Amino acid sequence: QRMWWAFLASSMVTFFGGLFIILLWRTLWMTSVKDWAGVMISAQTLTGRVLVVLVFALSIGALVIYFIDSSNPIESCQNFYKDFTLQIDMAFNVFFLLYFGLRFIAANDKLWFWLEVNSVVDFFTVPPVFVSVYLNRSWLGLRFLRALRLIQFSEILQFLNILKTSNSIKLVNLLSIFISTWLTAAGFIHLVENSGDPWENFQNNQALTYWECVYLLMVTMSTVGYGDVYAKTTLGRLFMVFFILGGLAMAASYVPEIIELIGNRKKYGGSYSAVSGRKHIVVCGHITLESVSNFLKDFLHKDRDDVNVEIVFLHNISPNLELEALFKRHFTQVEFYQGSVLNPHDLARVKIESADACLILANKYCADPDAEDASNIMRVISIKNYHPKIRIITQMLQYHNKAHLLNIPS
Amino acid sequence: LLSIFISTWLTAAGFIHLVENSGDPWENFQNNQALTYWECVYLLMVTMSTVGYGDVYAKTTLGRLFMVFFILGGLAMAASYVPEIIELIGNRKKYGGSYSAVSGRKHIVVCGHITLESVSNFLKDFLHKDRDDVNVEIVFLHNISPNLELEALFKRHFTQVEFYQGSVLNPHDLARVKIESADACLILANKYCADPDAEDASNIMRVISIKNYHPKIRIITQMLQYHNKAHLLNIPSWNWKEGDDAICLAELKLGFIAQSCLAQGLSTMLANLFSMRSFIKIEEDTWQKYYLEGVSNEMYTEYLSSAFVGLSFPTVCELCFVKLKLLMIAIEYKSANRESRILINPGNHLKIQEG
């Protein structure tokens, strides 16, 4: 009195016999309606957008219906007119069938359209409910596969103008994929465990709820494995072995994308934060180990009277290990930021408009002293263009170049 | 590797099954555990993933010793085969593959010296917010992989801009970006190079390659030196009348400067006249509002109506300014003796012809 084979074989034949028919045909006014169906379901059309939003919402509803019905016996008789929840489910299913037909009549190629995820979930969803309403006896089958539509969720978030950047869209896509595969693996485990082994007259059934199977999958994939719940049936244990192996492979395949979305942390980004009752000096120019070491040795002398002045270094070249150690030794008085004086955004970052002074150090060991002097004069011009009233102390290599400083009215 | 993994899994399961079902010999085989072979396969898989449910486990002393050895040896074996797994996985090519065409949407191939500044300026003018809706995508083709700044800039325009690693001189890469269906190819030059002539020759060779692949595609190229663009006339597929253009940077820049020497501010006027500028409403009495009133103007070309034929240029210009509120600057004069020539503000002796 268990005719689940009919429900399974319905999906099997609707997936295989029609594919074989298409293959046989290939081995051997419709254009207008095909183009109309293609433009009707196109993503550029507003009708296509509202229709895919509607089908996403109805797939969510079907998933909730499966969640409600999972607490019931898997294969049981029911009446068409005695409950309207099954009527809602079959209305959803016939809407899915109509949308599948619209996609099928608008498909440029039949074989590739017949071998995609939406087609196979429709094949495993709609013929079972047709057989159920024909025989007036339902079977909880592969209805969890509707969760596989959650992958399209990010696309909906792109149609609603909620997601704009590419990184957020890809993050939502990966999260949706992970959640959907988790839910569908839990559904397979729940079905195989609660049904029992067929060759042993279904005497191996284990009364596990769907959420206990979700919990089991989460405990397994973290490699924690409490053993409070586990699969007891032979086919369930085979499914768990396959799930462990496939999940290991899938996690290994998605490591580079996780690394890419994590990215690299900028060590010396961000902006200086002012402290009330405390001045700061911006230091720029040729920032290396020796010049900074000498300047800090005299400026932060132990015999110097208590002065509440912080030092903010601004330099585009990232410091090496020795400069990093030197900055760490004075971590309570010295901060470093990566940036250029010639960029006004970086000047706003170090709060040059409230700094007490700007000190510009020169490269004493350079091939062309005149080029170094001109670069420093241009730094002075940039700083004074941003804030004309700030005090500037600069280093000049050659004597004839400092006359250029008199050409700056600030 | 797959065969090695499967074989060692099966033989470890066989050892565990034998030792567990036989029992300990020194205790008269009273420690036997009735485990099937497939339960031992399942046990080995659960162990080597470090999940360890504990629903099934080895109970005998020799079985537990075998399991300890299996854990240690499997750890060592997995550690030894990591480099081979990495090698077979390899490195994913970030910018491989081919451009996929979309029906009812044109695309432009951009090549040459592709860096941050040139791409930024071109995209700032091309993808302007005030630009009328144009369904044109941009496909960059360049052998040098982009850096972090170019990657961020391409990500900001991920819905309109795609990048591909490849060379213009390679016909496979030209087939990848679908140069045979592109609306145009735009070649940018390296303005900061040691030898401008070498850069110009390289760009001319890129033009030769593109025209050899597809002779009918429209090409807009940048030329550094003026004497080099004559080489473009040696290409029989190069058609100036069909839209092929060379923009000479030196000639145009120094001509702008010379005309501003004759009348200062002319370079600013011309640059604002062909650039897209967003209009800003100013109500304060400053010079910015008077400036921005005239910034919004642009150049257009139109065929004169048949009612203007036989009339002098000053008459039609005054009619356009007073009635139509349009400033007509120049006309295109055609003749049988010579080619078409652009006439800037011709005198009253000239008369408007047909078309």
Place this chain on the structure above:
Amino acid sequence: MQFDDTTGVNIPIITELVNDTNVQFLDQDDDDDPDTELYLTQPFACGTAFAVSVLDSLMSATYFNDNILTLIRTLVTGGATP
């Protein structure tokens, strides 16, 4: 170029090329396609392009028969005796 007593298209030239893929840039009347091999292009078949890479094949030809190089040298260099 154009000449008066008429065009440079009939002037016989030979061009040395380093890359074989650049041979099809030398001719415009060719009906060749991008996938055409070097020896089937018009510039190669007409002798107006010399690809240096052919010498790389000569080494292999020398391995299977050492007299080929001697014949080529005595036919090509003009008769240079030892």
